[PDB]
Amino acid sequence: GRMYNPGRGISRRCIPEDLYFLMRAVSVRHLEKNKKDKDAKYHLILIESKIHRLTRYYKSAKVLEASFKYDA
């Protein structure tokens, strides 16, 4: 199933960078003008945890040197 939502989709290709694309994190940190948007804040945390899970993974794969630490 999906990592955070309970949806279970199976849209796939059928054979006969990604960390960069998640910093979405900046594109919503939008929260400056909309300080009351609690929906955005909850979804900001979810996207951030995706980064730290990917950050932790790439370090042990030596893709990223272990000095990496994403901030705002």
Partner: peptide, 10 residues
């Protein structure tokens, strides 16, 4: 094709 079976409990 995984799609051909793609157009559920536990």
């Amino acid at each position: 094709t995984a799609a051909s079976e793609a157009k559920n409990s536990y």
